[PDB]
Amino acid sequence: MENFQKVEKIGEGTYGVVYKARNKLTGEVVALKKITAIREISLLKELNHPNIVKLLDVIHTENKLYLVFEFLHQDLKKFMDASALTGIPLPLIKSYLFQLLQGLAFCHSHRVLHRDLKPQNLLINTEGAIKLADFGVVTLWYRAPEILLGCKYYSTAVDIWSLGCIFAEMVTRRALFPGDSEIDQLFRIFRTLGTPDEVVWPGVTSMPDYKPSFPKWARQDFSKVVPPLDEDGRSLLSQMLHYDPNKRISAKAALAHPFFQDVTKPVPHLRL
Numbered sequence: 001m002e003n004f005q006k007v008e009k010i011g012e013g014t015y016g017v018v019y020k021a022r023n024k025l026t027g028e029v030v031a032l033k034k035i036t037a038i039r040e041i042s043l044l045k046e047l048n049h050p051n052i053v054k055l056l057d058v059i060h061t062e063n064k065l066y067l068v069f070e071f072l073h074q075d076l077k078k079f080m081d082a083s084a085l086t087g088i089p090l091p092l093i094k095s096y097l098f099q100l101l102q103g104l105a106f107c108h109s110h111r112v113l114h115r116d117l118k119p120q121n122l123l124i125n126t127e128g129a130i131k132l133a134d135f136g137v138v139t140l141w142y143r144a145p146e147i148l149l150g151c152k153y154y155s156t157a158v159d160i161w162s163l164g165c166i167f168a169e170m171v172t173r174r175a176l177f178p179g180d181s182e183i184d185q186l187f188r189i190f191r192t193l194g195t196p197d198e199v200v201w202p203g204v205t206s207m208p209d210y211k212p213s214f215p216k217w218a219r220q221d222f223s224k225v226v227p228p229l230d231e232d233g234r235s236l237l238s239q240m241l242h243y244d245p246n247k248r249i250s251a252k253a254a255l256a257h258p259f260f261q262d263v264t265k266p267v268p269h270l271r272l
């Protein structure tokens with residue numbers, strides 16, 4: 001800590017308080033998060049990708065672990081709130097979706113999962129880049145149904161489900177499944193995608209928190225769920241939201257989806 005001057009608190013991430021800070025020697029401006037774990041965290045220092053927020057240093061000292069990250073100037077939640085009157089332009093949505101899928105394809109190839117993707121953890125800069133941060137009231141809005149049903153050994157698919165939920169929210173300007181308890185989160189999912197059964201998700205009825213007494217709701221039409229997203233966007237979103245984690249599209253396969261045939265990298269309008 002003595003090598004860093006706090007400039008301001010910018011957040012309380014899940015694992016602790018985050019400060020913007022300046023390195024007293026390097027002059028570098030960084031984000032400092034103050035929080036088996038040593039060895040895992042050290043392995044993250046190697047997982048470098050242009051769409052992953054760089055972890056610069058891990059400082060263990062005195063019952064405190066500090067993590068020093070590259071600093072970005074805005075998060076997607078704030079940008080979404082800033083762009084709510086007009087909406088984020090489709091080409092920028094597609095570019096951010098495509099970049100995030102590149103980040104996930106990289107992490108998943110190294111068998112690292114995020115598990116807690118949410119707009120506040122997706123960070124943007126003036127050049128049109130978006131990056132995944134801060135790998136794992138707690139928000140449930142992005143949690144995959146297998147996690148909600150008590151699967152202990154869930155997979156990379158959970159991150160595809162969270163990113164699908166964020167893709168829908170960029171497009172409609174409303175959270176897709178804004179649950180305020182675990183059951184309300186699961187029932188919001190069922191009310192929109194249909195209560196899952198053995199046909200669409202083999203094994204579902206033997207999940208730890210599955211109850212036969214769950215209400216059975218009909219699936220709704222996607223054209224009702226994300227207007228005015230085009231047929232290619234809806235097709236991709238449907239594959240990122242399949243109930244069975246084994247049928248859910250991978251990040252690698254999503255990158256090849258026809259929705260990205262015309263992807264580009266627009267500059268966002270950022271007011272810092």
Ligand SMILES: COc1ccc(CNc2nc(N(CCO)CCO)nc3c2ncn3C(C)C)cc1
Binds near residue numbers: 013018032075
């Ligand atoms: C004037 O206040 C602000 C507020 C937010 C930002 C946006 N930059 C960053 N925001 C956040 N978080 C706050 C989310 O709003 C925590 C994410 O878990 N973590 C970062 C940032 N840059 C690097 N890191 C690492 C710790 C990952 C800038 C300035």
